């Protein structure tokens, strides 16, 4: 029943907390200015230079961003195991569900690390300016911009981590995934999750009408950004032959 649904949510939050060391709550405390939390800002190359001692260029900035994805995939992968059902799927689907979902979680989760002015980096110890990123030489300039455009529209909904824990699981468990051998299992797990989420928003955000819908609408955005990253990667890989991707990451693209 409703009580049963309310339990899965707490289980999901708990794993969320356990899996991901930087929370929205923590990211927001560093950004809000609440002492120790405040981070080292980087807005020009000189800030970076010192920002290294403290905490091409666009390429060294990029490894960090791609690496961040790698660090996140490891946490996301651990988290998926945490969700009810996922470990009982055909091991080929776990892999698939993850291969297509990790990227969409990265950008959902990357929003909690930013405001219109920038994104937090390095476990929250720095802050890098959305302008400085735009400033970077093309094709790299372009990459962060659509993330922030999502982030802001996305953060606008004012979701706490307890809400994301369920949502980032609504994402992973997609019956819409390509090459999935057993869709029926997944769409049943997602039904519990979607229902947990529906309730979670109606309890935690009762004075916000149709947040559940408005939120699920925000996947269309998530998908568009991923395609852009892939398109950018196609160009980056062809132009920057001397760059490598992390195996784990090369796997989420082929």
Q: Structure solved using which method?
A: X-ray
What the block records as the tokens of 101 is: 């979902």
List, in sequence order, every beta strand (DSSP E) within 46-193. Answer: 114-115, 118-121, 126-129
Q: What would the two tokens of residue 132 be?
A: 């400085």
What tokens does 89 get? 């799927």
Partners of residue 128 on adjacent β-strands: 42, 119
How far is the C-alpha of 214 from the C-alpha of 211, rounded, in Å? 5
| CA nearest neighbour of 41 among 110, 133, 107 | 133
Lookup: tokens for 99: 């291969």
Rounded Cα gap, residues 118 and 130, in angstroms = 5
CB crowding 18-57: b at 16 or more within 10 Å, else e: ebbebbbebbbbbbeeeeeeebebbbeeebbeebeeeeee
The length of the chain in residues reads: 254
Distance CA 168, CA 143 (A): 22
Radius of gyration of the chain (CA): 18
CA 73, CA 132: separation in Å to the nearest integer?
26
d(CA 69, CA 229): 12
- Evaluate whether 232 touches 45 at the Cβ level (below 8 Å): no
Angle of CA points 3, 6, 11, to nearest 5°: 130
At residue 108, the 3 state secondary structure works out as: helix
Q: Contact at 8 Å (CB) between 24 and 117?
A: no
Query: Any idea where the domains of the chain sit in the sequence?
Result: 1-254
Distances (CA, A) of 123 to 23, 72, 181, 213, 236: 10, 11, 37, 31, 26
Distance of CA 188 to the CA centre of its chain: 24
């Amino acid at each position: 029943e409703s009580a049963d649904l309310r339990a899965l949510a707490k289980h999901l939050y708990d794993s969320y907390i356990k899996s991901f060391p930087l929370t929205k709550a923590k990211a927001r405390a560093i950004l809000t200015g609440k002492t120790d939390k405040s981070p080292f800002v980087i807005y020009d190359m000189n800030s970076l230079m010192m920002g290294e001692d403290k905490i091409e260029v666009a390429i060294r900035i990029f490894q960090g961003c791609q690496f961040h994805s790698v660090e996140a995939v490891q946490e996301i992968t651990e988290y998926a195991k945490s969700i009810p059902g996922f470990v009982n799927l055909d091991l080929n689907d776990q892999v698939t569900l993850l291969k297509y979902g990790v990227h969409e979680i990265i950008y959902t989760m990357l929003a909690s690390l930013m405001n219109k002015d920038g994104v937090l980096i390095s476990e929250g110890q720095g802050f890098m300016t959305r302008e400085f990123l735009k400033s970077l030489r093309k094709p790299f300039g372009d990459f962060m911009e659509p993330k922030f455009e999502f982030a802001v529209k996305f953060n606008a909904l004012e979701l706490d981590d307890s809400d994301l824990a369920i949502f980032i699981a609504v994402i992973i468990l997609s019956g819409d995934r390509p090459g999935l051998l057993n869709v029926k299992p997944i769409e049943d797990i997602q039904d519990n999750l979607l229902q947990a989420l529906e309730l979670q928003l109606k309890l935690n955000h009762p004075e916000s009408s149709q947040l559940f819908a408005k939120l699920l609408q925000k996947m269309t955005d998530l998908r568009q950004i991923v395609t852009e990253h892939v398109q950018l990667l196609q160009v980056i890989k062809k132009t920057e032959t001397d760059m490598s991707l992390h195996p784990l990451l090369q796997e989420i693209y082929k």
